[PDB]
């Protein structure tokens, strides 16, 4: 019944088959094209599907109003950069393309999934479809122990996060008599009960999982270290954003905004956010992890889009959450890039890469500026307007802690690209003293550079886009 | 009150004490082969609180992937890691043990408070007895989004495990 | 030769002592991410019971 | 309540059938010579003595043949009730499951190909 | 035998399943008590549907995905387990701390 909506989805699906078979014949294929193919037509498939119809839904399984595609038009995106950044990683380590880009297709479908899944049976199905594919590509690399210990890390404490929300699920459904769905559940249960704030932070256990807010964090800077670099890219894209899609798909429509006590527990959860994932980052020695700790401060700063729900905090939480894909696709992209060439190495070993590299140094500062919220570049109008819509609800508390934890973050950005550029011939690191002197990785940086610099002041384009998407949310 | 309801009891007390005692040396019990075994024992007593509770057909698809399928590959596993346990004793295990048990007793202290004081609305009607062709309505009609991605699911779980288990 | 050595001393100092506490709690509570998966679990079960209790 | 027609015989006679084994085998202990213990209890390796060390060498013969086992359990449980409601589901229903047991068949065939 | 009973029941043996699963220390234990928890919550969804939902039993459908996921994150489990045994040659999860 009303199948359309899937016409996105399914055409990723088919590509995950058919770049199976191909991989089941040939062994030795092109299947990073006709994936990246697959995901622009995937993405091309909402334009009639945006503005012509209303919102629709599935079977009430499913729905597709301008949220649900914007959040899948995200992760798609989010999959299409990450494809490119893993061609030449995973084939210059002894492994399979083909068996890989198949696990991050599912990983995207699931993701694309859970975006407009309005039903407790589906949204579990879609959360575990993501997470199994999230275990499999940590663990991808299965020569390094690094990799191996972060991925049973990484499925323990998941596989408990879901138990949890499993938990929380079944109280929800038992709860409202039957109803799986989540808008009659709402027209059930209106009325603050014990069972429905179990329920509720249940729920919020496995939430805070996906969208790392602390004390929910404490995987990621073990999973950004251990997980190949272009699966962290996607994990802190693609996995935040349905994480962050499920949570307002869920709490706004789902626990009746009469029990606004998630308001209270995620001001709790960004306060802490803000506080240690940017304090901790502070002192850190590798990149990977920096941007682990990194991630855990922007998820906290996204938490006050919808801790002050005012049809604007809504609208600088997508705007956000959009900028950060072009922000940390560009940040992972020169951090593969740099690994690649020579270093495979942490922060102290960029010393001096002005002088060998320039684009890189010049690819990279971008990158890690809009991240630090810089003039005119992305982030700097991502993190005003988060700011903004902050005061004006009234939270005072909320963003004068985050302007303190921008600069926090200011420091620890900046004291990346002062190795990148201060150095003279003396004081390169040994990964750059000897420093060797592809084109889908190329083409990708300089695509997410170019948009993170563009993107910020050419912004009105994409601030109709986020209020059309909004205007959906409940309230 | 009747011969019917008092063996509906008897049975559902002897179950639940089999499953807590089983579940208690799943994770209590030192050797882990008798955990892999005992939690066979789990998994059969619960699929038979599930009879109990009128639904026939997942019992016996829980008998199939529980205790035929997923016990079986937990026991093989459990075979493909025998090192004679050479564990040495770390200082920093009663901080760990003791924080384990008292969130799990008041976690369940919690649950328990909620599950007595909460109204369930218990709809007095009685259950139906054909759960197996209602089951096959709900995956074509209202579960059909899930019933069409646990495929691929099982697709991606293959593919990703003979990836992480192959040897080369 | 007060003055210079208060602004040496005193004010320089009073404006460097953030920094350097920033500096410390970071380094010292990186160790919060112990590196075992159980205590990462016993962290994410206090969250619970916890919240649940405000 | 209980409305599941046919349980009162499993109950009883999945008793009697533990029965069976539990009370052969008390009326073999009854009923059968005492001990045996100094060399009889030694493990039969035709007749030599036991190598020593007495490992396996381990390998994933077994557990692939298990992983792939359990794949198609669950598609087994997914395919049941889709047969039995084969009548009131009709057509629609046939390209559903249709599509699902293609998707299992890929399974299989990229299992069949390493 | 009333939904008060069974809710307890699984709640308990949540309860027992997350103490396995964070103070035990071999690796296939903690799998076997994630295995603990998901049928803590089928408990749950069957109980519900049988005297809640009694007619169009939902529960029952969403108990049957629960089992063929768990058994799919088992699956998935195993293999981490042996890749990880593969490389470390233990299963003592108090050996795999990379950190300070
Ligand atoms: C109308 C029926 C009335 C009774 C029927 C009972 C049938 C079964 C039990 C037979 C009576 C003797 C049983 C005692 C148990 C025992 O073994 O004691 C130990 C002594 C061993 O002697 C002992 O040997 C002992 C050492 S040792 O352990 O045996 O090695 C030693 O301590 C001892 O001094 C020495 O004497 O053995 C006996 O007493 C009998 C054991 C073998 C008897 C087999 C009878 C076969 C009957 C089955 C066929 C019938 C068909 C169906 C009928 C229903
Ligand atoms: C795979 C390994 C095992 C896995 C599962 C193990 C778990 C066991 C399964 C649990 C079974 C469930 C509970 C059984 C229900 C008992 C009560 C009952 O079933 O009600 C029936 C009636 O219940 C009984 O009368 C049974 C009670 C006696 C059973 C006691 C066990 C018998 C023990 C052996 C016999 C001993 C006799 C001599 C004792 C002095 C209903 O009758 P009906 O089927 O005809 O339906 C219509 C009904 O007639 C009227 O409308």
Redesign the pocket.
């Known amino acids: 019944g009303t199948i359309l909506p899937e016409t996105i989805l399914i055409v990723t699906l088919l590509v995950v088959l058919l770049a199976d078979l191909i991989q089941g014949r040939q062994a030795d294929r092109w299947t990073p094209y006709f994936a990246i193919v697959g995901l622009g037509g995937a993405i091309a498939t909402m334009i009639p599907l945006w503005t012509q119809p209303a919102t629709i839904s599935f079977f009430g399984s499913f729905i597709s109003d301008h949220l649900s595609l914007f959040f899948r038009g995200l992760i798609a995106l989010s999959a299409l950069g990450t494809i490119l950044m893993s061609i030449r990683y995973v084939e210059q380590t002894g492994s399979s393309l083909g068996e890989f880009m198949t696990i991050l297709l599912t990983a995207t479908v699931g993701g694309m999934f859970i975006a407009g899944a309005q039903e407790l049976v589906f949204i579990f199905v879609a959360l575990e479809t993501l997470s199994i594919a999230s275990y499999l590509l940590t663990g991808y690399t299965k020569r390094d122990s690094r990799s191996n210990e972060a991925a049973l890390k990484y499925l323990l404490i998941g596989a408990a996060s879901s138990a949890i929300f499993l938990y929380g699920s079944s109280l929800l459904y038992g709860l409202s008599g039957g109803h799986t769905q989540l808008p009659a559940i709402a027209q059930a249960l209106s009325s603050e009960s014990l069972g429905l704030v179990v329920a509720l932070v249940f729920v919020i256990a496995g939430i805070s999982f996906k969208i790392s807010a602390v004390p929910f964090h404490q995987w990621t800077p073990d999973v950004y270290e251990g997980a190949p670099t272009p699966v962290v890219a996607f994990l802190s894209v693609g996995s935040k954003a349905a994480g962050f899609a499920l949570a307002i798909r869920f709490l706004t429509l789902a626990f009746p905004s009469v029990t606004d006590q998630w308001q209270l527990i995620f001001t709790v959860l960004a306060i802490l956010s803000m506080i240690l994932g940017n304090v901790v980052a502070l002192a850190q020695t590798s990149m990977k992890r920096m941007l682990a700790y990194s991630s855990i401060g922007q998820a906290g700063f996204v938490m006050i889009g919808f801790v002050v729900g005012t049809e604007a905090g809504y609208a600088s939480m997508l705007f956000y959450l959009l900028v950060y894909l072009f922000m940390n696709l560009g940040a992972f992209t020169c951090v593969i890039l740099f690994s690649l060439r020579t270093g495979t190495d942490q922060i102290s070993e960029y010393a001096g890469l002005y002088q060998k590299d320039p684009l890189l140094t010049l690819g990279l500062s971008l990158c890690l500026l809009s991240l630090g919220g810089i003039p005119p570049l992305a982030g700097f109008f991502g993190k005003i307007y988060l700011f903004w819509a902050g005061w004006q609800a009234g939270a005072y508390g909320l963003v004068l802690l985050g302007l303190l934890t921008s600069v926090i973050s200011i420091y620890y950005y900046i004291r990346v690209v002062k190795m990148m550029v201060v150095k003279e011939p003396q004081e390169m690191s040994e990964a750059v003293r000897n420093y060797p002197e592809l084109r889908p990785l190329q083409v990708g940086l300089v695509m997410t550079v170019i948009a993170t610099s563009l993107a910020g002041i050419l912004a009105n384009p994409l601030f109709n886009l986020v209020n059309t998407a909004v205007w959906d949310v409940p309230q | 009150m009747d011969?019917?309801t008092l063996?509906?009891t008897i049975?559902f007390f002897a179950?639940a004490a089999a499953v807590i005692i089983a579940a208690l040396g799943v994770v209590l019990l030192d050797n882990v082969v008798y955990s892999a075994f005992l939690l066979g024992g789990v998994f059969?007593?619960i699929?038979?609180?599930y009879?109990?509770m009128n639904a026939d057909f997942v019992?016996a698809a829980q008998?199939l992937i529980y205790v035929g399928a997923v016990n079986v590959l937990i026991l093989f596993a459990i075979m493909l890691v025998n090192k004679r346990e050479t564990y040495t004793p770390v200082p920093g295990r009663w901080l760990r043990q003791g924080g384990a048990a008292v969130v799990s007793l008041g976690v369940f202290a919690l649950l328990t408070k909620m599950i007595l004081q909460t109204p369930w609305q218990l709809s007095s009607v009685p259950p139906t007895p054909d759960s197996i062709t209602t089951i096959g309505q709900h995956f074509f009609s209202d579960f059909l989004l899930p019933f069409e991605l646990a495929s691929v699911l099982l697709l991606m779980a293959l593919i990703g495990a003979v990836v992480l288990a192959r040897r080369e | 030769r007060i003055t210079a050595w208060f602004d040496r001393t005193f004010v320089d100092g009073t404006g460097n002592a953030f920094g350097v506490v920033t500096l410390l709690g970071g380094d010292r509570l990186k160790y919060s991410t112990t590196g075992q998966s159980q205590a990462y679990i016993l962290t994410i079960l206090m969250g619970i019971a916890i919240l649940v209790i405000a | 309540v209980?409305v599941?027609?046919?349980?009162?015989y499993?109950?009883?006679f999945?008793?009697?059938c533990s029965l069976v084994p539990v009370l052969a085998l008390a009326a073999s202990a009854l009923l059968r010579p005492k001990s045996g213990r100094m060399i009889r209890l030694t493990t039969y390796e035709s007749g030599m003595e036991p190598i020593g060390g007495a490992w396996i060498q381990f390998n994933v013969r077994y557990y692939m043949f298990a992983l792939v086992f359990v794949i198609f359990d669950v598609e087994t449980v997914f395919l049941y009730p889709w047969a039995v409601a084969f009548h009131q589901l009709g057509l629609l229903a046939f390209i559903e499951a249709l599509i699902f047991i293609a998707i299992l068949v890929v399974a299989l065939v990229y299992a069949w190909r390493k | 035998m009333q939904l008060t009973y069974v809710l307890i029941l699984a709640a308990l043996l949540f309860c027992i399943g997350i103490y396995g699963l964070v103070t035990s220390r071999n690796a296939v234990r903690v799998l076997m008590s994630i295995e603990l928890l998901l049928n803590a919550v089928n408990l749950n969804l069957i109980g519900f549907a049988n005297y809640l939902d009694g007619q169009q039993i939902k529960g029952q459908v969403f108990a049957v995905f629960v089992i063929t996921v768990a058994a799919a994150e088992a699956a998935v489990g195993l293999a981490i387990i042996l890749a990880i045994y593969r490389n470390r040659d233990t299963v003592d999860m108090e050996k795999f701390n990379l950190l300070k």
């Open positions: 011969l019917a063996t509906q049975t179950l059969l007593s699929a038979g609180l009879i109990l019992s008998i | 209980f599941l027609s046919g349980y009162e499993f109950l009883g999945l008793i009697i």
